[PDB]
Amino acid sequence: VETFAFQAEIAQLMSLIINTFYSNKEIFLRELISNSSDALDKIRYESLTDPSKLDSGKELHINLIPNKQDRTLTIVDTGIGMTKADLINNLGTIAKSGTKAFMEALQAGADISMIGQFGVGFYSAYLVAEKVTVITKHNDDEQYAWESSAGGSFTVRTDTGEPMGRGTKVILHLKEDQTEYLEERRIKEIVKKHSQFIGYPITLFVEK
Ligand SMILES: Cc1c2c(n3c1CCN(C(=O)[C@H](C)N)C[C@@H](C)[C@H](C)Nc1cc-3ccc1C(N)=O)CC(C)(C)CC2=O
């Protein structure tokens, strides 16, 4: 298990997201679904030039899986996935500028729901999650688990759990007071409001 410091700008953003009073937390789900959709767009595009990129799975979809026993909501996609370099360095490097602009825009009167316009919508997960785990598999690399409970650090390790084939799972370990996001009616409501036109099937799993 390797431990890394977040880019300073990203630690600042995470603290802002955790500390700012902002009741409209439900927008986190749209941002995660958007990342999944963009990841699915990318593998679809790449597979046109190279059909073998779907050898790791032809199905292009998004699953939403609540688990009340574990107090987790997982967003699963069969998109392009992320390499180790993406997880550790590359996406966060790119996200530095967006992070800075967002925080500047908030100082000027924007609100937290506009986060996705700055390319850092992933971090909205911390509106509702105390810990986020990202399990991901890209065709060119092994399966990795990224994890952070904020506090300025994240970890990456090779994942020895069930092989995914290709794609990304974002596991939200929900805060004690955010369990409404495990309720079928609540998730259905948010998906219809903010994510009704996503171009891949979204399956909301129900609890046994
Ligand atoms: C930024 C950012 C970040 C993450 N994703 C993105 C978002 C980075 N990104 C974009 O902002 C695009 C260019 N608008 C490319 C996406 C789509 C990429 C391939 N897949 C993806 C990425 C993210 C989340 C889910 C998925 C996922 N579910 O696959 C996750 C992590 C690297 C742990 C931290 C972080 O800074």
Side-chain angles (χ1 to χ4, degrees), residues 1-68 70-106 108-161 163-191 193-208:
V1 177
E2 291 180 310
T3 304
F4 304 87
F6 280 114
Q7 289 281 351
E9 289 88 359
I10 295 173
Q12 290 181 40
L13 173 64
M14 288 174 80
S15 290
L16 182 156
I17 288 168
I18 290 166
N19 293 328
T20 302
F21 185 74
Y22 183 74
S23 301
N24 184 37
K25 288 173 182 286
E26 69 182 37
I27 65 89
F28 82 90
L29 186 61
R30 166 190 78 201
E31 299 303 326
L32 304 180
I33 292 174
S34 179
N35 286 335
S36 292
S37 182
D38 286 351
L40 288 158
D41 285 350
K42 190 159 191 184
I43 187 54
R44 182 166 168 27
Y45 173 75
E46 287 192 10
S47 71
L48 270 185
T49 289
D50 185 357
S52 71
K53 291 186 173 180
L54 295 184
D55 286 349
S56 45
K58 292 189 165 309
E59 283 189 86
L60 301 183
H61 65 239
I62 301 169
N63 297 329
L64 308 177
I65 309 175
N67 185 310
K68 279 174 79 184
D70 297 350
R71 210 167 80 193
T72 59
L73 175 67
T74 304
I75 299 79
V76 182
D77 69 67
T78 50
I80 189 111
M82 285 168 285
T83 61
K84 195 180 182 190
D86 280 335
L87 281 179
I88 294 170
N89 229 299
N90 296 338
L91 293 176
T93 285
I94 300 301
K96 284 207 304 172
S97 66
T99 294
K100 180 173 175 267
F102 177 46
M103 291 188 294
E104 286 161 2
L106 288 172
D111 76 284
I112 282 163
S113 73
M114 296 161 75
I115 186 167
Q117 298 183 53
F118 303 90
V120 289
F122 166 78
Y123 292 96
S124 72
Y126 291 91
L127 289 169
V128 299
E130 65 184 4
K131 181 167 72 182
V132 179
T133 310
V134 176
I135 311 297
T136 192
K137 178 66 172 72
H138 189 282
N139 284 334
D140 296 342
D141 212 341
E142 294 180 44
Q143 188 165 303
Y144 296 99
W146 173 108
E147 195 166 69
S148 184
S149 299
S153 74
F154 65 93
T155 62
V156 177
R157 69 198 70 182
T158 297
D159 188 43
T160 55
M164 297 174 48
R166 186 198 62 250
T168 299
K169 311 205 311 208
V170 178
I171 308 168
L172 307 176
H173 309 265
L174 297 176
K175 298 176 197 177
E176 155 270 325
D177 62 348
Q178 299 302 326
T179 64
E180 69 190 81
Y181 302 110
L182 302 169
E183 299 296 340
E184 181 176 11
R185 309 148 100 190
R186 181 70 171 115
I187 297 163
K188 176 181 157 175
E189 174 186 49
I190 296 165
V191 169
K193 185 178 192 178
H194 296 294
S195 305
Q196 51 175 335
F197 298 123
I198 291 288
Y200 302 94
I202 301 172
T203 302
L204 172 55
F205 285 33
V206 294
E207 303 224 47
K208 310 183 285 304

